[PDB]
Amino acid sequence: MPIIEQVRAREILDSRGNPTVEVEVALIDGTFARAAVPSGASTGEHEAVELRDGGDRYGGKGVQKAVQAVLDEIGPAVIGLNADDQRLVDQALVDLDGTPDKSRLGGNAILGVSLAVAKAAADSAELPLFRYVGGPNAHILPVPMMNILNGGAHADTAVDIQEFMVAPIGAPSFVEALRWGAEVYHALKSVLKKEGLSTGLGDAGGFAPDVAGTTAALDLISRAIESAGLRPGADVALALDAAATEFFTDGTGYVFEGTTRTADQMTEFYAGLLGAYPLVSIEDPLSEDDWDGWAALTASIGDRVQIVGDDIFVTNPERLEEGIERGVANALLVKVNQIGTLTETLDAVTLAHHGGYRTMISHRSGETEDTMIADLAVAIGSGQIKTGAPARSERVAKYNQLLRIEEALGDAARYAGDLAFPRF
Amino acid sequence: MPIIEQVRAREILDSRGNPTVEVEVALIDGTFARAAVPSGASTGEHEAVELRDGGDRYGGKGVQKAVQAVLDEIGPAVIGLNADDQRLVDQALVDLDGTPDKSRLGGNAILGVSLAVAKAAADSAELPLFRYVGGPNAHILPVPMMNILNGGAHADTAVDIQEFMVAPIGAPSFVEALRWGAEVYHALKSVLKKEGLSTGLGDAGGFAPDVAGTTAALDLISRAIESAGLRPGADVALALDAAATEFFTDGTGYVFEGTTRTADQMTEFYAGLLGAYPLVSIEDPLSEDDWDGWAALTASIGDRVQIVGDDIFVTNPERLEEGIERGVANALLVKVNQIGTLTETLDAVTLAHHGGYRTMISHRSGETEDTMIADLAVAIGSGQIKTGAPARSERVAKYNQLLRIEEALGDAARYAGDLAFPRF
Amino acid sequence: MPIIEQVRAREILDSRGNPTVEVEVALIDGTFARAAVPSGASTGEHEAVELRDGGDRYGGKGVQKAVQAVLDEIGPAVIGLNADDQRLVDQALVDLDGTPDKSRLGGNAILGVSLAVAKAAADSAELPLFRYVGGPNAHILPVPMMNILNGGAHADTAVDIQEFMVAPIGAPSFVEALRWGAEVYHALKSVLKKEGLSTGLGDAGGFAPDVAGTTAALDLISRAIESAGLRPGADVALALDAAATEFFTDGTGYVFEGTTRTADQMTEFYAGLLGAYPLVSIEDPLSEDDWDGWAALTASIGDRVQIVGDDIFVTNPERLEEGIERGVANALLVKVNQIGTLTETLDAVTLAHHGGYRTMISHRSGETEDTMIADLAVAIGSGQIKTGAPARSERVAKYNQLLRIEEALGDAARYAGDLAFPRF
Amino acid sequence: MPIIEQVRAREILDSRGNPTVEVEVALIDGTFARAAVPSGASTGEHEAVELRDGGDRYGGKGVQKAVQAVLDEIGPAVIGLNADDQRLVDQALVDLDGTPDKSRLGGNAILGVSLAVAKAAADSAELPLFRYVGGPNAHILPVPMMNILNGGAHADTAVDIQEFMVAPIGAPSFVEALRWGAEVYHALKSVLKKEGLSTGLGDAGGFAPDVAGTTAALDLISRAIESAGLRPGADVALALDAAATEFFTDGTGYVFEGTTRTADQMTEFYAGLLGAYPLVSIEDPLSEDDWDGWAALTASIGDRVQIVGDDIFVTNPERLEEGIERGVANALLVKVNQIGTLTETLDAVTLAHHGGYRTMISHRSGETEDTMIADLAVAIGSGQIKTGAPARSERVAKYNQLLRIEEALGDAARYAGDLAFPRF
Ligand SMILES: [Mg+2]
Ligand SMILES: [Mg+2]
Ligand SMILES: [Mg+2]
Ligand SMILES: [Mg+2]
C-alpha cells in the first residue's frame, strides 16, 4: 500500500530569506507528505554538499538545480519503492548520487526526499512521526537548549563564544520548561534595556549585545534567570556553543578574547567557567580537526560537563567512530542535513547511544516552518534539543510541536529535565 | 481505530510441558493478535512474580488464576484504550496490579496483555513487529548465541558452567550464521558418539555430556567447529552462561569445580579461559547480589570480554542503574518476562544502550511457538540473541523468524557479526 | 476472489535443525497463508521423494532446489487458479511434476504449495482450517497418542520397539486428556531418576532409557500412570509403534529381542503383550512389504486391538487398497508428506474411512511450528493423533492448537476418548 | 459476520400438493438463504415427528403451527448465533424442542431452520453448498438410482416390491449417466405402449403397470435398457426398494406374491433374483424391527449385493449403531427429514462411513424445488443418490443441480460409476 507514486520539489524561502528545497511525496494509497530542508549560515568542511544554482538569482543561492534533480533523477529512482523501507529508499538515493558527500544531486535534494518519504510512511501507518520513527517507547520530551544571546561569527562584538543557551532542567514538564525559557528570554530583553545594550535580534532569534566577553554574557543571563524568579543551575542552567573552528587558524591556534591560545589553554579557560557558572554543556570547545586537543579536554573536564561535537562529527558515522575510539567528546549534535538522509542520521545516533554518548537534535540558522526535528528528538529519546530562542516561528514551531507531542503522550510523557545532564 | 475491544487468555503448554498464559487482543478495526508468555525453569529472586494455581493440577503449575485475572480485571482496565499507547497500556496494567513485583495479577497475566497489545498495534499500522517496535531503522540481524552443551543446574554432571554457546561471528549474513550454527551442532553430535559420551538432549535443546568440567567442554566444541570446516574464533567463537548464583552459597562463596572460591578466584579462573579460548561473552560469572565481586571482575577483564548481567539485573531498570553506577558488567540479558511489560523492557534497554552497555535478547527454558523475541532483537538492534541450540521448534521458530526478517529487509539487512564483540 | 496471485518458498530449519521448505501463497483478495513441510528422520521406501540439494551445505540436506522449483515452475502453473479448487490445484502440481513419486519437483515443494493454498482458501472463506477442510460437522477432538519413551532406530538400547505411547482415553475432554498426558510424562521423568536411568531426550521429545526390552519399558510407563493418580487402561492405555521394517532383513526375518523371528512369531509376541498390558493400538508390527504376515496377524489379533499401517501404506491410496483387499491392518497412519498433496491425503482417508479403517494423523521426526495437522485431525474426525510427547514446541504447538479448536467449538466439541478404540 | 439476524417460515406446497415448511434465514452481513422440507407419503414408525395442524384445512395436513413455532420459539433461540456453528445451532434446536422425536416443534420446523442456516453459512463463506458441507475434497458425482416402475403401497397392482430402479453404473460421467437414465425411462414408456400396459405416472414420477410381479417387472426394464442401446448390468444395472414393512404383519410374516413367508424365505427369494438379474442394491428387503431376519439375510447375501436400511435406521444414529453391532445391512438410506437436523444427519453418515457402510442420499415422495440433497450427496461422497425417475421437476431439479456441480468441478469431478458397487 505505501508505494511511492509521485515525487515533486519546489524552491521556497528559509527563515533567513534564502532559497531551500521542499519535497512532496504521494503514495498510491492517497497519502501526501511535505518536507523542507534547513540550511546552515556557516557550514562544516565535512558536511554533505548543498547543490546551489550560482548566477545572479538570489545571490547565487537558488536551488532550481536541486528541484530539477528531484524531478529528473530521484523521483524516477524511488517511484514504486515502499515508503516503509526507509533504508532501501535512502540507499537508492545514496547509490544514485554515487558521491561520498552527495555533491552530484545535493544533500538538499536527497534529504528532502528522505524526510518526505518518512513522513508519508508515518501518515500511511496512521502514527505520529515521533512514534513511527521511535516506536511505541518514544516518550521523552527534551530539555530545550535556547540560544538567547549571540557572539562569535553571529555578531560584530568582542564575544568569540557563538551561542549562550539557557536549559530549564529543573522544570517538571516540557510545557513548564518552555514557559521558564520564554520568561527568561523576556526578562533578558528588560535587563538589556536597563544597561542601554541593544535588544536587536540575530538569525537564531536571540540578542547580540556588544559586551566585554564570555563572563560578562553569562552574568547578564544569570540576572535574567533571577529576574524571572528562577534559581540559576537548579532551575535554569547554562550551555555554550563555542563553535571554536570559527576562531581557529589552520596549523596556528585559538584567537580567543584577544590572545592566541593552545587547545590546552582553551581547556584551562573552560574549566575556569565550570567552577564559576552552572554549565551543563559546551559544544565545539575546539576546532573540527583538533583531534588531540579534543581528547585532552574530554579527559580533563568530560566527567564534569557534557562535551558536544558539532563540526568535528557533522552527524557522520565515519567521523563519530573516529572520536569514540579517540575518547573525543561525550555527546553528538544531530543535524540531518549534515549527512543527507534519515537512515544515516539514525545510524549515527545508534553509534552515539550504544557508545555511551548523548545526542542533541539541532536546527540550522536557515530553518523552515517544518517541525520534523521536534518529532525526531522524541523519536530517539535524545532528552535534549537545540532549536533556538523562544521567538521566531522557525524556532517556536518546534517548541509548539513538542507541546503537541507532550499532550498526545498524556501521562506517558517524561520530561528529561536534570536526567539529561547527570554530570551536573 | 486501534482501540482495544476484547481481551481473552487461555492456559496452554510451554516447551517443557508446563502450563503458561496465552493472550488474544481484538481491536475495533478487526485486528486480532496472539501472544504467549515464556517461563524460566529456575527464576532469579528479583524477577516479576508468575501467578500459579497450586494444588494437584499440573504439579501446582496451572495458570487458570492468571487467565481469570485477564478476564475479570485486566480486560476491563484496557478495553477502550488505544493499542498504539503501549506506555499508557503498560502503565494501566502496572497501576491495576499495584505491587512492585506484579504478585497480585502475575507478571505472566500482565506480560501476555502487554505483548498482545503491541502485536495488535503493529498489525493495525500494517508494519512487521520489528519495524513497529524499532522504527524504520530496525535492520540489524543478531549473532545467534547457541547453547549446544549444558552443565550446572541443567544436568547431573561435573560441569558447573550452565551453558556453552557458539557464536558464528565471522558469518557474512544471518542465513549463513544459522547454517554455521546448525553444522557445528550436528558435528558436535558426531564427535559425542566418537567419545561414547551421551547425545541425549536437555530443555534448551543442547547436549549434557558427563565431562571433566569447563575446559573439557570447550575442547569438544572447538573440535566440532573444526569438524564443520570453520575456524574457532575467526568464524565461530565461544560464550558461557556460568549462571554463578546456581553454585553460590549465601554469605559463603562459589562451589566451583570441587573447591569453594572467592569472587576474585572465579575472576582468575575466567581470565585463564580468556587466554586459552576464543571467548566473546561470559554471562553471570558471579552471583545475583555479589555487587563488589562483579565490579572487581569487570575492572579486571571487562576490556577483554563482554560481561553479561542476567540474574543480577532481571531486566529491571532499578537494578541495571545500580550496576551502571557501580561499574558492574558491560551488557544486559533482556528477558521480557523478568520485568512483565514491553514498556519496562524498552526502558531497561534504553538505560543499557545510552549507558554504553550491549543487550542480548534471551529466551526462557520454557518457551512457546511465539517468535516475538526474534522481532524484538532486530527492533532494538541488540546485535545478539540467546534463543537456544538449532534444534526444537521453540528455539528454531525464532531462527526461522530471523530468516524471514532478513529476507523482508533485503539489501537493508546488516548482520551484526564481529561488530557485536569489539573487545574480541 | 480467492485467485492465486503469488507463490514463494524459502529454506527454514525443522525441529532437528535440518532444512525444510516453507511456502507462502497470496490471493488477489489480499489473503496471505504460510505452510511448512515436515521431514521424516528414516523414510519408507514408497514415500514421495524430497528434493535435497546434495553438496557440502547442511550435510547435503539443503532445499534451495525445492525453493527454486516453487518459484521457476510451480508458481507459474497455479497463479490464476482458484484456491478453493484444491483438487484442480493438486492435479496441476501432480501433472507438472509428471512422476509417480514427485521426484522431479519434490514432494516437499509440492506439499508446501498444496497446504499453503488450502490455508489461503480457509482464510478467504473466513473459516478456521479444520472447518474449511472438514465442513461444519468437524468437531471430534482426537485422543493424543504421546510417545514418551523411545527404542529401535531412535536409540542405542536393547529396545527394538520404536515408540511407547500413552493414550488418555478415559479423559472427559481434550483439555483434561492433554493434562493427563503431561502429568504422566512428568511422573515418568521422576520414576526414571528413581532407577538411575537417563532422562536425556530424543527427536520426538520422549526419553530413551537403556532398559531390558519391551515389557521392562511398559512396566515403567504403567508406574508413571499410577504415579500420576490415573488407572492404567481405564484412564491411560498404551500403544506401540514397532516400526518392524527397522528390525527386518529383506527375505530373512525379524531380528527382535536377540532372536530372528517369523511374522507368525512376532504375532505370538504381540498377542502375549495384549494379555499382559492395556494395549489399544500397535503400529507397523511387521515390515513394509510383508503382505502375508500382516494378513495373518490382523486375522489373529485385529479383533482384539487396532493394527496401524504406516510404512506399508505410506498414506498411498494404491497401497491402502492392496491392504484392504488383503485384509491387512484396521487403521492407516496419515502423513501428508508421504503422499505430497492434501487432495491425495483425503482420497486415502476416504478409502480408509469408507473401508471400516480408522485413521491416526501423524507428525514426522522433523516437524515445524506449523499446526496444520491438529486442524486436519479434527477436519477428518480421526479421533486419534500421533504428534509427540508433551514437551518440545514442534509437538506442543499441535496440542495447543487442539486446545484452541476445542475452545472455539464450545459445547459442539466431542472428545473421541474410548470411542476411538472399541476393541478395548 | 455470519450472525443469524432473522428467521421466518411460510406454508408452501410439496410435489404432491400437500403443505410443507419453507424457512428463510438472513445473516447480519446481508446473506439470505431459503430451505424447504420434504415429506414422506408413508413414514417409518421411528422418524422425527412432523407437526401438522389437523382440522378441515388441506385434509388436516396444514403446517401453520410449524410456521408459528419457527416465528414464536425457534427464531428467538438462534438469532445472534453464528451460522457456521451448525452443531451449536442444531443443538439449540434439539434442546429447545426437548423431545427425543421432535414432537413439540416438529422435525419439519427444525429441519427447515437447520438447512436454511447451513445454506446461509455456505453463501456467507462464498462456497457452493457441496463444498461448504464436504470441504474441498467433495468431488464424487453419485450414481443416480432412478425409480422408473412402481409396486407395493405405491400402486394397486400385484407387485409387492415398491420401487424398481435403474443404475447407470457403466457411464463415464454423471452427464452421460443422466442421459442413459432418461433414454431408458423413455424406452420403457414405448415398451409399455407395445404391451398395452398403462403409461400413467405415480408420485415418484415412474410408471405403475399392472404386471404379474417382481420378475415380470424386471424383464420389462431389461427390455427398455436394451431398447436404449445399453447392456443390462455392464451399462445399466438394477436395484429394488422392497420396503418390506409395507407387506409385513406385526408378529406374523411377509405377505409377498400371494403367500405368507418367513424372513429366511424372503432371503431365498432375493438370492433367487441375484442369480437371474444384474442387481447392485436391495433396500428394506425385511421389516423395520425384524433385527434377526436382517442379520440372517446380510450374512446370506450381503457379500453378493448392497443391502440398504431405510425404515430400520430412519437416518437415526442410535438405530444404525444397533444394526452395525448386529451385522444388519451394509448401507444406510439418508433422509434428512427422518432425523430433523443436518448435524444429526452427518453424525449418522459418519457412523455409517467409518463402519464400512455405504450411504445413499434419498428424496421423499413429497419433494420441493429444493436441490440441497444433490449438494449433500456430493458433500458426503456417497457415490449414490435416490431422487426419482428422470421426469417431474421435484426429481429433475436434483439431476440438473448434479450437472451444475459436475460442471463447476471440471476435471476434479469423479463419477462413482461401478466403484459404488464393488460386490457386483
Ligand atoms: Mg555549532
Ligand atoms: Mg542466565
Ligand atoms: Mg511409524
Ligand atoms: Mg424406502
Residue numbers in the entry:
A (entry chain A), B (entry chain A), C (entry chain A), D (entry chain A): 1 to 424
Please give me the paper's original passages concerning this structure.
Here we present structural snapshots of Mycobacterium tuberculosis (Mtb) enolase in apo, PEP-bound and two 2PG-bound forms as it catalyzes the conversion of PEP to 2PG. The crystal and the cryoEM structures (enzyme in solution, frozen) along with the biochemical studies clearly demonstrate that the functional unit of MtEno is an octamer.
To find out if the exact reverse of this reaction occurs during the conversion of PEP to 2PG, we systematically mutated each of the residues Ser42, Asp241, Glu163, Glu204 and Lys335 to alanine, compared their activity with wild type MtEno, and elucidated the structures of three of them [Figs. 4(a) and 4(b)]. Notably, the K335A mutation disrupts the nucleophilic (proton) substitution, the E204A mutation defuncts enolation capacity, D241A should make the MgA 2+ coordination in the active site highly improbable and S42A should absolve the MgB 2+ coordination.
